[PDB]
Design a protein around this ligand. Structure first.
Ligand code: 96I
Ligand code: ZN
Ligand code: ZN
Length: 842
DNA sequence: GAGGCCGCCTGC
DNA sequence: GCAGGTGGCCTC
């Protein structure tokens, strides 16, 4: 019934390989595709490709199945094409009995004219199917949700009869994960030295720089005891009646939980212990390294980092031995004097670059000079930026050196004007993108302004962030919301991508984009991208991990054309508060992460509010002078970078909103200590700037949940403080220094923590919003010491904008332009990944 | 124009 | 329960 067709080709031990088999009425040769029924009868058929056929000594006939992945098993779920399969690195040996039937699976390769095949309608993009047999076009990575072009691994001249792509690639992954040694250097009594070693595809030689976890070694200087903050001191509960609402010790924006950055070492020795027979134990690789001091690691504490370059180190003669498996990555450490270029050009010339000019003696606590032995382009893509705003994303991409934004679409006129100011020679369209795309498809060459429309082949990269108004909820779809989505700017942006078919595609959005409508917006976006034939992936990034003193999580969808390489998500550059670095995404109870491996530490210290704005001169509430003096040189590395090389005699847009007299008094009465907000306000009468009076807040009702103060005073301010009682209007009090609504509804709003809250110099900004309001949702917008809200310039600094970047309109317009923009450092990290792909193209 | 006021859901 | 994520709309 089942037997071989022919004679043997290789009798290896207990198995005998054959090239073709016969089962019942059909024949199977290697390369065909088969189905296997799972143990649960209702589950769909498993599909695989047969890569080897043999017979076992004690089991029977066997074959090797390289499994396909059903489209619904991927992140696309039910949105997938019901007959589309994906290549995966899943395979196993299986008894030939399990084979159910032979199936026809074809590879739909993109044509040589793929870039001109776009133009299908949103209905086809969202829901259209191939309407053919089983087909596959992309290889799928299930842990990172990555769709990429199928790998081109070639067989051998001796292992082609039993060749499995999955087996070969898994062997490659294991071998690269193995840390190995290389060319031997010397044989000592105790160990064997080597010149080079390999780990995760990275080569480490003697003298190279190594990242190490902060726990790898300690410094000879003592970590002198910091005075731990005592418990909450008793306060005058009558003078500060709302202080009791601060019973939690969690401070928003604090960096006390931020992890330490990497230890930096220089490889002095690579060695392995010797077995008693003299042969080295190459499974136990050790490295002896020389210690580098960050400035904050010297006897001078954290303050030494305020002015120093973020990549400046001090050589030391201290040494430490660590396991080779503890190395987190390779880095370059150079003595600055013998450098073929200036230190700034070096620092900007590549990743993981550090320099040292002096040495540090921990015992002496002085800076001597290092010893003698311490010594030793592509064309830019023409880019279309849809929903550009003032141009933060385009600016970051340009800083990465990958793009010339030749066309921009921005419907809001002040932001369009700002983009024009910063990008002369770029065509900015203020029309509806649907109107522009319809004109292009109709065959127009110019819009009603005479501006030349981009055509197929002009757009080499497409980037943008589309708003998601009308379907920004977490609840499941219905007919109305789904119609609103398929008529939305997200779908319009996808249509732009389908029509122009650029080499690279970037969709940026708020974090919750990955979860909208039960992750259905994300699933449909990925489905459209796959339908076009694009390689694609998604992830969540924290902007603070790339050089800004701001927590800003954003959703990123990346797509690469066939024949290109799919970019990786950038590894974090700066350590950041872990609470703000939760980047995993749950889709259909499956947890997806990005390729990022830097979870515990990073190469650079976190950027703080001090780094962000310590150099800006003091201004008053309602400051309106558009052009003032810096009154001094930049103080931090961040300030030097954002001020730039050319001297800037004028500071621009250091202006703040003119808050009312009551709000100004409230801000003036917010304490300067970290974590201070409205709950620290004193309950006093104060005469305002306009001659009017701000009155005491009278506590008129009893809060059984919150109780009474130390003086027996009540804590409720309205009848609603009772169980079922409704708000009596007569209980509403006006013009109180402590705003009435905050204690009115504080019990169900986490006591409105952060409203009228001051920033912390050692801390970071909360998400920079379009309009700073102390009593809004994001109310922690007060200056650390000045009695005002943050300025436009301070918001731009929090976003990482260069000081020369031009804004347009009134102060609210400029605030909105800053708030709506992608931070240029984040954009630049993404662009650097894109450049890696550009340089690595086959 | 600006200021007061403040529901609903999710992840842990 | 705690923390985070979303402005908008009444009313003057
Ligand atoms: C925490 C501050 C707040 C916000 C905010 N940011 C809010 N934004 C929503 C709204 N404005 O509809 C909303 C707008 C657009 C998209 C999604 C949601 N709504 C609040 N609600 C509910 C409605 C309101 N009528 C009473 C209080 C509160 C509070 N507290
Ligand atoms: Zn295999
Ligand atoms: Zn009430």
């Amino acid at each position: 019934r089942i037997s071989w067709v022919g004679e043997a080709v290789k009798t290896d031990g207990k198995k005998s390989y054959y090239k073709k088999v016969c089962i019942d009425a059909e024949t199977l040769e290697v390369g065909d595709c088969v189905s296997v029924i799972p143990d649960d009868s209702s589950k769909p058929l498993y599909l695989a490709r047969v890569t080897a056929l043999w017979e076992d000594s004690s089991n029977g006939q066997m074959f090797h199945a390289h499994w396909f992945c059903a489209g619904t098993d991927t992140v696309l779920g039910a949105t997938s094409d019901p007959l589309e399969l994906f290549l995966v690195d899943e395979c196993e040996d299986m008894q030939l009995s399990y084979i159910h039937s032979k199936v026809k699976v074809i590879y739909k390769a993109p044509s040589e004219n793929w870039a001109m095949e776009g133009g299908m309608d949103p209905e086809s993009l969202l829901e259209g199917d191939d309407g053919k047999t089983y087909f596959y076009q992309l290889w799928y990575d299930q842990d990172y949700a990555r769709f990429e072009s199928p790998p081109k691994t070639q067989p051998t001249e001796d292992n082609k009869f039993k060749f499995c792509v999955s087996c070969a690639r898994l062997a490659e992954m294991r071998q690269k994960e193995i840390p190995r040694v290389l060319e031997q250097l010397e044989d000592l009594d105790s160990r064997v030295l080597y010149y080079s070693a390999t780990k995760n595809g990275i080569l480490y030689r003697v003298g190279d720089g190594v990242y190490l976890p902060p726990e790898a070694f300690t410094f000879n200087i003592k970590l002198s005891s910091p005075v731990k903050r005592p418990r909450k001191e008793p306060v005058d509960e009558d003078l500060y009646p709302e202080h009791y609402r601060k019973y939690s010790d969690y401070i928003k924006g604090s960096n006390l939980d931020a992890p330490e950055p990497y230890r930096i070492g220089r490889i002095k020795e690579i060695f392995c212990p010797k077995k008693s027979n003299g042969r080295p134990n190459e499974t136990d690789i050790k490295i002896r390294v020389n210690k580098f001091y960050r400035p904050e690691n010297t006897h001078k504490s954290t303050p030494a980092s305020y002015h120093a370059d973020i990549n400046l180190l001090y050589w030391s003669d201290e040494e430490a031995v660590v396991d080779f498996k503890a190395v987190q990555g390779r880095c370059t450490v150079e003595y600055g004097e013998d450098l073929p270029e200036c230190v700034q050009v070096y620092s900007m010339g590549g990743p993981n670059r550090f320099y040292f000019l002096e040495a540090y003696n921990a015992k002496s606590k002085s800076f001597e000079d290092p010893p003698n032995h311490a010594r030793s382009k592509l064309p830019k893509l023409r880019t279309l930026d849809v929903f550009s705003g003032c141009g933060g994303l385009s600016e970051g991409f340009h800083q990465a050196g990958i793009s010339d934004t030749l066309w921009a679409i921005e419907m809001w006129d002040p932001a369009a004007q700002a983009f024009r100011l910063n990008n002369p020679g770029s065509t900015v369209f203020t029309e509806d993108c649907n109107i522009l795309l319809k004109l292009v498809m109709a065959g127009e060459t110019t819009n009603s302004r005479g501006q030349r429309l981009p055509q197929k082949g002009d757009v080499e990269m497409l980037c943008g962030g589309p708003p998601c108004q009308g379907f920004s909820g977490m609840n499941r779809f219905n007919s109305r919301t789904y119609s609103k989505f398929k008529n939305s700017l997200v779908v319009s942006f996808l249509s732009y991508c389908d029509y122009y078919r650029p080499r690279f595609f970037l969709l940026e959005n708020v974090r919750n984009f990955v979860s909208f409508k039960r992750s259905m917006v994300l699933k449909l976006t990925l489905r459209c991208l796959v339908r076009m034939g694009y390689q694609c992936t998604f992830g969540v990034l924290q902007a603070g991990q790339y050089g800004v003193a701001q927590t800003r999580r954003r959703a990123i969808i990346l797509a690469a054309a066939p024949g290109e390489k799919l970019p990786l998500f950038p590894e974090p550059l700066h350590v950041f508060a872990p609470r703000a670095c939760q980047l995993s995404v749950v889709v259909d109870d499956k947890k997806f992460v990005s390729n990022i491996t830097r979870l515990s530490s990073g190469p650079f210290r976190t950027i703080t509010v001090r780094d962000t704005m310590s150099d800006l001169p003091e201004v008053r509430n309602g400051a309106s002078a558009l052009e003032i003096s810096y009154n001094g040189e930049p103080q931090s590395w961040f300030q030097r970078q954002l001020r730039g090389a050319q001297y800037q005699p004028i500071l621009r847009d250091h202006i703040c909103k003119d808050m009312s007299a009551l709000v100004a008094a409230r801000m003036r009465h917010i304490p300067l200590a970290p974590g201070s907000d409205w709950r620290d306000l004193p309950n006093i009468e104060v005469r305002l700037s306009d001659g009017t009076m701000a009155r005491k807040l009278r506590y008129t009702h009893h809060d059984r949940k919150n109780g009474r103060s130390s003086s027996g005073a009540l804590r409720g301010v309205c009848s609603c403080v009772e169980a079922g009682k409704a708000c009596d209007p007569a209980a509403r009090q006006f013009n109180t220094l402590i705003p009435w609504c905050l204690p009115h509804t504080g019990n169900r709003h986490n006591h409105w923590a952060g409203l009228y809250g001051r920033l912390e110099w050692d801390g970071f900004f909360s998400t920079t919003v379009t309009n700073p309001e102390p009593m809004g949702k994001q109310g922690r917008v007060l200056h650390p010491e000045q009695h005002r809200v943050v300025s436009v310039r301070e918001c731009a600094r929090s976003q990482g904008f260069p000081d020369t970047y031009r804004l347009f309109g009134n102060i609210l317009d400029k605030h909105r332009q800053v708030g709506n923009a992608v931070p240029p450092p984040l954009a630049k990290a993404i662009g650097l990944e894109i450049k890696l792909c550009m340089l690595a193209k086959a």
